[PDB]
Structure formats: C-alpha cells, structure tokens
Amino acid sequence: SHTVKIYDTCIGCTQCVRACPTDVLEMVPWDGCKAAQVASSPRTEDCVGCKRCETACPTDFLSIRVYLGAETTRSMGLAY
Amino acid sequence: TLSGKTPLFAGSTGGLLTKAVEEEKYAITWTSPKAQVFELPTGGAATMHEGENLLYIARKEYGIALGGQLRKFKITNYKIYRILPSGETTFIHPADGVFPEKVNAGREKVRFNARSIGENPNPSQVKFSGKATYDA
Amino acid sequence: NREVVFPAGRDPQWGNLETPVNASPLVKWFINNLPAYRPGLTPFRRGLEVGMAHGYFLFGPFAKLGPLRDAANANLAGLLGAIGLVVLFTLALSLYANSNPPTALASVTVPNPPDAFQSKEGWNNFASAFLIGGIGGAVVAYFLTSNLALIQGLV
Amino acid sequence: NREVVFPAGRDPQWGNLETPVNASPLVKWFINNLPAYRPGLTPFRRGLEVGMAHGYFLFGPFAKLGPLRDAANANLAGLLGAIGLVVLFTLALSLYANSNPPTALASVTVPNPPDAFQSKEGWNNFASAFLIGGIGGAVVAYFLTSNLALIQGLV
Amino acid sequence: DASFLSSIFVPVIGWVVPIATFSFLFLYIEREDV
Amino acid sequence: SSISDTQVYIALVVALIPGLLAWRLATELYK
Ligand code: CLA
Ligand code: CLA
Ligand SMILES: CC1=C(/C=C/C(C)=C/C=C/C(C)=C/C=C/C=C(C)/C=C/C=C(C)/C=C/C2=C(C)CCCC2(C)C)C(C)(C)CCC1
Ligand SMILES: CC1=C(/C=C/C(C)=C/C=C/C(C)=C/C=C/C=C(C)/C=C/C=C(C)/C=C/C2=C(C)CCCC2(C)C)C(C)(C)CCC1
Ligand SMILES: CC1=C(/C=C/C(C)=C\C=C\C(C)=C\C=C\C=C(C)\C=C\C=C(C)\C=C\C2=C(C)CCCC2(C)C)C(C)(C)CCC1
Ligand code: SF4
Numbered sequence: 025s026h027t028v029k030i031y032d033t034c035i036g037c038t039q040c041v042r043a044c045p046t047d048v049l050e051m052v053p054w055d056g057c058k059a060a061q062v063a064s065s066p067r068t069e070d071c072v073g074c075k076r077c078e079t080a081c082p083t084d085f086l087s088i089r090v091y092l093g094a095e096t097t098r099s100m101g102l103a104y
Numbered sequence: 105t106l107s108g109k110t111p112l113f114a115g116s117t118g119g120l121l122t123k124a125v126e127e128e129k130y131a132i133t134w135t136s137p138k139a140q141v142f143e144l145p146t147g148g149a150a151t152m153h154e155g156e157n158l159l160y161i162a163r164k165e166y167g168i169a170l171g172g173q174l175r176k177f178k179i180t181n182y183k184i185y186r187i188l189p190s191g192e193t194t195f196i197h198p199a200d201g202v203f204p205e206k207v208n209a210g211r212e213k214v215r216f217n218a219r220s221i222g223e224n225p226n227p228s229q230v231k232f233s234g235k236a237t238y239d240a
Numbered sequence: 241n242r243e244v245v246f247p248a249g250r251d252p253q254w255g256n257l258e259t260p261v262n263a264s265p266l267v268k269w270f271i272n273n274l275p276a277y278r279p280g281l282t283p284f285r286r287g288l289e290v291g292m293a294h295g296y297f298l299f300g301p302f303a304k305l306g307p308l309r310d311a312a313n314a315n316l317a318g319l320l321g322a323i324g325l326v327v328l329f330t331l332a333l334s335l336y337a338n339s340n341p342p343t344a345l346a347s348v349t350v351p352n353p354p355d356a357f358q359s360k361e362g363w364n365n366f367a368s369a370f371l372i373g374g375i376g377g378a379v380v381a382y383f384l385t386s387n388l389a390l391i392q393g394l395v
Numbered sequence: 396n397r398e399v400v401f402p403a404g405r406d407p408q409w410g411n412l413e414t415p416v417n418a419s420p421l422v423k424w425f426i427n428n429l430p431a432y433r434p435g436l437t438p439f440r441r442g443l444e445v446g447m448a449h450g451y452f453l454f455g456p457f458a459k460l461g462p463l464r465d466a467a468n469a470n471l472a473g474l475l476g477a478i479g480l481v482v483l484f485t486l487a488l489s490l491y492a493n494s495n496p497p498t499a500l501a502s503v504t505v506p507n508p509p510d511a512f513q514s515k516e517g518w519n520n521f522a523s524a525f526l527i528g529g530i531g532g533a534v535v536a537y538f539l540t541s542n543l544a545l546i547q548g549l550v
Numbered sequence: 551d552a553s554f555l556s557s558i559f560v561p562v563i564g565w566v567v568p569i570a571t572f573s574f575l576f577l578y579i580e581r582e583d584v
Numbered sequence: 585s586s587i588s589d590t591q592v593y594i595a596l597v598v599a600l601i602p603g604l605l606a607w608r609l610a611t612e613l614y615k
C-alpha cells in the first residue's frame with residue numbers, strides 16, 4: 025500500500041480527513057498544537073494515493089505526506 | 105447478515121463485477137426519513153426507501169462518495185461494511201463509532217513523525233539499509 | 241408497452257442487464273447448445289466439434305485470398321495455411337491451459353459453464369481435440385473445394 | 396571445484412547417484428515435461444501425444460529403407476508399415492495393461508510419476524490414445540513426405 | 551553452396567525463437583513458484 | 585567467390601561455444 029505519514033507541524037484543522045475519499049485519515053488527541061489534535065493514518069491499505077489530503081493541508085509544506093509505494097487492488101482503485 | 109432494502113432502480117451496467125464474488129465486496133447501509141431520489145456512484149438515479157437501506161458496491165470509495173452525498177439529505181447514520189467471499193463481514197466505516205473528523209478518545213497516533221519534514225535524513229545515509237528516508 | 245430490459249438475477253446491483261439480445265429464449269437456446277456449453281460433453285467432444293467448425297471456415301481466407309490464390313495449388317496453400325493457424329491456436333490453448341487458468345464465467349445467457357473449462361486437464365483435452373478437429377475440418381474443406389466436379393453427376 | 400556427484404535425497408544407502416546427467420535442472424525440466432510425466436494431463440492426452448510423435452518418426456525407416464523404397468509406392472508402403480507397427484505396439488500396451496502391471500517408478504530425475512501409470516485403466520486409456528495418435532502421426536508424416544515436391548513448389 | 555542455411559535460420563529466428571521465447575516468458579511471468 | 589561450406593559449418597560449431605558460455609553466464613547473473 026502507499027505510506028501516509030504525519031509530521032509534527034500539524035495544526036489540527038481536520039481538512040485532510042474531510043478531503044480523503046477512502047477513509048484513511050482520522051483525528052486523534054494530541055497536545056502539540058492549539059487545537060489539541062493531529063491527523064493519523066491507520067487505514068493506509070485503503071489509500072489510493074490521490075493526494076487530496078496534501079491539497080487540503082494549510083501549513084507551509086505539508087504536515088501530511090503520501091509516499092507512493094506498492095500497488096494493490098485497492099491502491100490502484102479497481103472495481104474488477 | 106445485513107438487513108436492508110435495495111434502492112429502487114432498474115439496474116445499470118456500472119454495477120459490481122467478478123471481483124465481488126472472488127476478491128471482496130462492500131455494502132453501505134443507512135436509514136432515511138422518507139423516500140427520495142439519489143444518484144448512484146455507478147451512475148443513474150435511484151429511490152431510497154423510507155427506512156433501512158442496503159446497497160452493495162464494488163469499492164469503498166463508492167461508499168464514501170455516497171455517504172458524502174447522503175449528508176446533503178441530512179443523513180448521518182450510514183455504515184460501510186467489507187465482505188469477503190467466505191462471507192466474512194467486517195465493519196469499517198465509521199470504525200470507531202464516531203466519524204473520523206471528530207476526535208474520539210481511544211484512538212492512537214499512527215505513522216506520526218516527531219520532526220518536520222525538512223529534518224528527514226538524506227537517501228544516501230539510508231542506502232543499502234532497507235529503510236526509507238521518511239521511516240520513524 | 242411493458243418493460244423488456246431487466247436487471248439480471250432480480251438484483252440491480254450487478255453490472256448486468258437482461259435484454260432481448262442477452263436473454264432471449266432463442267439466443268439462450270443457441271448459445272447453450274454450442275459445444276462450448278452443451279450439457280453432457282467431455283472436454284474432448286467439445287474441442288473436437290469446435291475444431292472441426294474452425295478448421296473448416298479457416299480454409300477459405302487462406303485459399304481464396306493468399307499469395308498463391310491464382311496458382312494451380314491455391315487450395316493446397318489454403319489447406320496448409322489453415323493447418324498452420326490451427327497448430328498456432330492449439331499452442332495458444334496449451335499455453336492457456338498450462339498457465340493455471342482462471343475459471344470460466346457464468347453469465348445471463350449461460351448460467352453454468354462446464355467443468356471442462358475449470359481445470360488444466362480439461363483444457364488440455366479441449367486443446368488436443370481442437371488440433372484433431374481443426375486438421376479434420378481444414379481437410380474436409382479442402383476436399384469439398386477441390387472436388388466440386390462431383391456435383392456434375394448429381395445433374 | 397566442489398563435488399558434482401551426490402547421493403539421491405542425501406541418503407547414500409539407495410542404489411542412486413545424483414549426477415549432472417541425472418539431476419541437471421535442464422535435464423529435469425526436459426524429462427518432467429515430456430508427456431509421460433507432464434503435470435495436468437489425463438491418460439488419454441498423454442497417450443495421444445506419445446502416439447503422435449512415435450507414428451511420425453516410425454514412418455521414416457519403413458518408407459526410405461523398406462523393400463519398395465525405390466518404387467512409386469514407396470511412401471504408401473512406409474505408411475502401411477508404420478501403421479502396422481503402431482498397431483502391434485498398441486497390442487503390446489494392451490497386454491501390458493491387462494496383465495495387472497506393476498507401478499511406475501520415481502527416480503532422481505522424476506520425483507513423482509503420474510497416477511495414470513499406476514492402475515489398469517490408466518494404461519488402457521493410454522493405449523487407446525496411443526493407437527489414434529500413432530495412426531495420425533504416421534499419416535501426417537506420409538502426407539508431408541509424399542507431397543513434399545508440391546509443398547516445395549508452393550514455396 | 552551453404553546458401554540453403556538461410557531458409558532454415560530465418561524461419562527459426564522469425565517463428566521458432568519467438569514462439570519458444572514468448573511461451574517460456576509467458577509461463578514464467580504467470581508462475582507462482584519463483 | 586565466397587568462403588566454402590566447410591568454413592560456415594565450422595563457424596556454426598565454434599559459435600556453439602559462446603552460446604553455451606552465454607547460457608551459463610546469463611543463468612549465473614540471475615542466480
Ligand atoms: C488490417 C487489414 C488487412 C487486411 C484485411 C488484409 C488482407 C490480406 N492480406 Mg494483409 N497486411 C496488412 C493488413 C491487412 N491485410 C498489414 C497491416 C500488413 C503489414 C505490412 C499486411 C501484410 C501482408 C502480407 C505480407 C501478405 C498479406 C496478405 C493478405 C491477404 C491474405 C490474408 C489471409 O490469409 O487471410 C487470413 C485471415 C484469417 C485467417 C481470418 C480473417 C478473419 C475473418 C475473415 C473474419 C471473421 C469475422 C466474422 C465476420 C465474424 C463472424 C461472427 C459469427 C457469429 C458469424 C488478404 C488480402 C497476403 C497476400 O497475398 O495478399 C493478397 C500476403 O502475402 N498481408
Ligand atoms: C540388426 C541389424 C539389421 C539392420 C540394421 C537391418 C536393416 C534393414 N533390413 Mg534387415 N535383417 C536383419 C538385420 C538387420 N537389418 C537380420 C538379422 C535379418 C534376418 C534374416 C534381416 C532380414 C530382413 C528382411 C527379410 C528384410 C530386411 C530389410 C531391411 C531394411 C528395412 C527394415 C526397416 O524398415 O526397418 C524398420 C526399422 C524400424 C521400425 C526401427 C529402426 C530403429 C531406429 C532407427 C532406432 C533409432 C534409435 C535412436 C538413435 C535412439 C534415439 C535417441 C533419442 C534420445 C532421440 C533395413 C535396411 C527389408 C529390406 O527391404 O531390405 C532393404 C527386408 O525385406 N531385413
Ligand atoms: C446461426 C446463424 C448464422 C451462422 C452460421 C455460421 C457462422 C455457420 C458456420 C458454419 C460452419 C463453420 C460449418 C462448419 C462445418 C464443418 C464441418 C463440415 C466439418 C466436418 C469435419 C469432419 C467431419 C472431419 C472429420 C475428420 C477427418 C476427415 C480426418 C480425421 C479427423 C476428423 C475425424 C476430425 C448466421 C451468421 C449466418 C446468421 C444467423 C444465424
Ligand atoms: C530434443 C533434442 C533432440 C531430439 C529431438 C527429437 C527426438 C525429436 C523428435 C521429433 C519428432 C519425433 C517429432 C514428431 C512430431 C509429430 C507430429 C508433428 C505429429 C502430429 C500428428 C498429428 C497432428 C496427427 C493428427 C491426427 C490426424 C491427422 C488424423 C486423425 C488422428 C489424429 C488426430 C491423431 C536432439 C537429440 C536432436 C538434440 C537435443 C535436443
Ligand atoms: C465469433 C466470435 C467472436 C467474435 C470474433 C470476431 C467478430 C472476429 C474476430 C476476428 C479474428 C479472431 C480474426 C483473426 C484473424 C487472424 C489472421 C488475420 C491470421 C493471419 C495469419 C497468418 C497470415 C499466418 C500465416 C502463417 C502460418 C499459418 C504458418 C507459418 C507462416 C505464417 C506465420 C505466415 C468472439 C471472440 C466474441 C467469441 C467467439 C465467437
Ligand atoms: S492519498 Fe488519497 S486516500 Fe490517501 S490519505 Fe490522501 S486523500 Fe486519503
């Protein structure tokens with residue numbers, strides 16, 4: 025699957041979780057930002073790699089990054 | 105396993121192919137206050153039932169697109185399942201019981217790096233070691 | 241006035257439609273009685289009939305349109321060209337058999353494909369039968385083409 | 396620099412040696428995919444391919460070395476000799492089959508022979524197939540030599 | 551008078567080598583052993 | 585005019601030697 029990693033410059037504005045079409049991302053409790061929340065990627069096996077989360081991220085270069093990796097039926101987005 | 109009524113449409117060729125019986129299959133369930141017309145992710149118009157609905161789909165992204173559409177109909181109780189050819193039904197969305205846009209306790213940080221991205225090491229420092237630059 | 245196009249299996253969620261082309265009793269009669277789907281046939285019997293039909297018609301394009309179609313050995317050249325395609329098709333079928341092939345699909349027209357096409361042994365039987373039937377069909381087409389003069393005794 | 400000759404199965408007690416002639420991966424590829432030993436074949440399919448090849452080469456010495464090899468009837472006499480000897484071989488296979496024969500042996504090269512050659516029915520199916528394949532292989536060798544002037548003439 | 555070798559080698563290069571090579575490579579890329 | 589039949593046959597027999605050595609090298613490079 026692809027690898028989605030969240031860096032510590034997150035501000036917890038939850039926009040990556042909203043942008044995600046395949047439910048990879050979720051918000052968890054945290055204490056390193058004012059909103060007290062980071063994004064987390066437990067379901068990277070559902071990640072198709074479309075990078076809407078990186079489009080949605082407001083920090084100057086990307087608290088979240090998708091690293092494209094091996095291809096599966098889910099990551100290639102095949103209905104067949 | 106899953107209780108619900110199939111929405112009213114005369115069928116499409118955009119539905120689910122041989123991957124459903126051989127690899128994996130998804131289902132979305134929701135309840136509606138009334139019977140109204142929605143658009144299928146496969147294409148076409150369909151009427152949902154007043155009450156419990158069940159609509160089998162080929163991909164998970166179909167269910168999350170449909171669940172994003174059902175929010176425009178003020179419907180927020182939708183559930184997405186993953187079904188294997190053995191009959192194994194697992195509940196994936198929302199997995200925690202709370203939608204992932206809201207913080208719930210009991211969730212842990214997965215794949216968090218405690219540094220900024222410009223602080224990743226060089227590729228030549230990690231060469232032949234079997235690790236990525238963005239690992240840990 | 242009534243609707244003629246239906247979802248297949250009475251389940252609209254499949255990528256299927258029952259149409260007159262797909263699900264006519266005449267169409268479902270013709271398709272289910274081809275040797276690829278006719279019930280009660282061994283893989284060899286299915287392949288033998290498929291090969292005879294195919295070697296029979298493949299004679300024609302090689303015989304009437306090849307490089308030697310104006311020579312005195314036009315029919316022999318068409319015979320050999322048909323046999324070369326039948327051998328290449330047998331090689332394709334044996335390669336398909338040996339690759340651990342996926343299952344034959346059921347459909348709207350044919351709800352049960354045979355167990356001939358579910359295993360490597362059935363596909364090997366089918367392929368060898370296709371070779372024998374194909375050479376026989378090309379030889380019978382060559383023979384009926386080179387001997388049209390026996391219809392003069394029919395008159 | 397290292398040893399190339401080994402006991403089979405790492406046990407020196409059997410009357411066996413793994414040699415390069417015995418246990419090369421190329422030699423083990425070739426013997427194991429000969430139709431006597433190829434996986435995924437019914438006994439009919441094995442006998443049919445074995446028969447085809449044997450009828451084809453056995454056409455040769457009857458046609459080119461027999462009594463009639465200088466006559467105009469040379470190739471047909473060779474065909475009749477190869478078909479008669481294919482029929483004698485089929486009779487020998489059927490007598491071997493109906494004698495309740497012993498089992499086929501694994502060796503260094505073939506770790507596991509097919510179950511076709513373990514009972515009487517597999518041998519009888521093999522021999523029935525060997526007959527058909529043998530007559531077909533002899534006929535195809537007959538037509539490729541007796542018409543070899545015309546086949547060269549088509550070029 | 552070895553010009554007859556071309557009518558062997560050119561059909562071998564054009565038909566026999568592609569069929570044997572593509573058959574090996576097809577059954578190798580579909581194999582699940584190695 | 586050209587070279588003889590014996591020289592072409594000898595060259596093919598000699599070319600069997602880098603054929604065999606190339607088979608061994610290509611299998612070793614994979615191994
Ligand atoms: C794509 C179009 C096309 C077509 C139609 C042809 C046609 C032909 N070429 Mg040609 N060629 C082409 C492109 C084409 N060429 C290209 C792109 C090149 C590459 C440079 C060549 C190079 C070439 C050479 C070198 C030669 C030819 C030759 C030939 C002839 C004999 C072919 C033969 O044996 O039939 C083989 C055909 C078949 C085995 C099957 C054909 C498919 C059947 C007829 C259709 C069946 C479908 C059916 C209708 C559906 C049935 C449904 C069922 C339910 C009823 C023929 C006139 C030869 C010749 O002498 O020319 C006169 C020759 O020497 N061609
Ligand atoms: C043992 C030696 C020997 C040999 C080689 C021959 C050879 C021959 N005899 Mg003869 N004969 C012999 C002894 C021998 N005879 C004896 C002892 C007698 C008793 C009196 C006779 C009585 C006799 C008569 C009465 C006649 C002949 C005839 C013939 C000729 C045709 C026979 C034929 O079709 O063979 C058929 C051969 C086979 C079916 C098989 C051949 C064996 C193959 C080639 C072995 C190949 C092994 C291979 C290399 C291994 C492959 C390895 C693999 C990995 C590829 C032929 C030249 C006939 C003729 O016309 O004379 C010219 C004839 O009428 N012979
Ligand atoms: C339905 C229909 C159709 C179709 C038709 C068709 C397409 C046809 C085809 C046909 C054909 C395609 C035919 C075929 C024929 C074949 C035959 C006639 C064959 C026979 C053969 C034989 C008999 C052989 C035998 C042999 C020999 C000789 C040798 C040895 C081996 C063997 C035994 C195999 C159409 C479209 C028009 C229209 C609609 C309806
Ligand atoms: C490997 C090798 C080798 C060897 C070789 C040989 C041993 C070969 C053989 C070859 C041969 C020996 C071949 C054969 C072929 C055959 C064929 C080609 C056949 C065919 C047949 C057919 C096709 C038939 C059919 C039919 C008919 C026609 C009628 C009816 C019946 C039937 C179906 C059966 C050497 C030492 C050189 C070197 C190294 C490598
Ligand atoms: C019916 C049917 C169908 C359809 C189909 C169509 C509509 C058509 C197709 C078509 C096709 C499928 C065609 C093909 C063609 C092919 C060709 C065009 C060939 C050519 C070839 C040649 C020319 C070769 C020659 C040769 C030989 C023989 C030997 C050696 C030398 C050479 C290589 C030269 C399907 C599948 C759905 C299913 C089943 C039924
Ligand atoms: S790449 Fe796509 S699926 Fe993956 S986390 Fe980003 S938006 Fe979600």
Ligand code: SF4
Pocket residue numbers: 030033034035036037038039040041062063080081082083086087088
């Ligand atoms: S968009 Fe970026 S900063 Fe905002 S919650 Fe998502 S990962 Fe964190």
